[PDB]
Amino acid sequence: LGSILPFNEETADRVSAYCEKNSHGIPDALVEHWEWTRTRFPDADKMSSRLQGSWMIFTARDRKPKRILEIGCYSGYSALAWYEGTRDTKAEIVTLEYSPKMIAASREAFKKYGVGDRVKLIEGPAENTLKTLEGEFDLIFVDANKDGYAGYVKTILDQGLLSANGIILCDNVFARGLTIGPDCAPWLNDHVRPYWNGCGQALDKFSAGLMEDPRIDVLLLPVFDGVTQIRWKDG
């Protein structure tokens, strides 16, 4: 017996709606931004869900990080969630993105919502820009190109960008299930199958690699699209 409840599509969606209804809601402005994003961009399925937004805000309010690093900004949704979750502490948020279209999208949203005082967006290939950062981050959200995750984590660990009591959260580790195998998401539309299959293989390599690193404790949690939590091994 396993640790994951089996649901069909309709029922998964019902249970997700139930979780939303019975969890703290995200702000109206964030809902608005989520819908705006889905209206403007054909690849908006890359953006985190509403429930995931609730999770980001809860996690930031709970952990109270002093500085947050995000890799993969897209339209700025998850950055706005980190911002909401850190209103009390006024945490610095750094987010990395390489697409001009999405840079423009994000700066537009940040101006509209009034979050530029704490959110810093750095434009460029994250594999390069990540290395240029200094100091440390208490919470790091890795959510960019899947085939880059290993490199990102390597940089983060090698340069000490993760604070002693910090956590790394890696998103979409399951690649809709295809990380486990090409046969693990029959419901997925064939049109996006190549992409996600590509991500799956990469994310499998990544996952296996984490288990070979004596510096860290690793937990792959079967929630959302798969979330890997990484921390420094004690002490």
Per the annotation, where are the binding residues?
48, 74, 97-98, 126-127, 145
Best CA proximity match to 85, nearest among 111, 108, 110, 118: 118
Does 215 contact its own copies by CB under 8 A?
no
Tell me: does residue 144 bind ligand SAH (CB under 6 A): yes
Spatial CB neighbours of 162, under 8 Å, sequence gap ≥ 6: 136, 137, 140, 156, 168, 230, 231, 232
Are 51 and 81 a contacting pair, CB within 8 Å?
Answer: no
Number of residues that bind its own copies (CB under 8 A): 65
Is residue 11 a contact point for its own copies (CB under 8 A)? yes
Binding mask 88-117 for its own copies (x = CB under 8 A): x-----------------------------
Half-sphere exposure of 36 (CA within 13 A, CB side): 16
What is the spatial distance between Cα 106 and Cα 77, in angstroms, rounded to a whole number? 8
20 contacts: CB under 8 Å, gap ≥ 6? 50, 51, 54
Quick one: which of 78, 155, 179, 207 contacts ligand SAH (CB under 6 A)?
78
Region binding ligand SAH by CB under 6 A among candidate stretches 23-31, 44-52, 155-163, 187-195:
44-52
| Residue 218, both tokens | 């690793």
The separation between the first and the last C-alpha atoms of the chain, rounded to the nearest angstrom, is: 34
Our finding on whether 31 is near its own copies (CB under 8 A) is no
- Chosen from its own copies, ligand SAH, none, partner binding at 42 (C-beta under 5 to 8 Å by type): none
Cβ closer to ligand SAH: 73 or 162?
73
Residues of this chain that bind ligand SAH (CB under 6 A): 46-48, 72-74, 77-78, 96-99, 102, 125-127, 143-145, 148
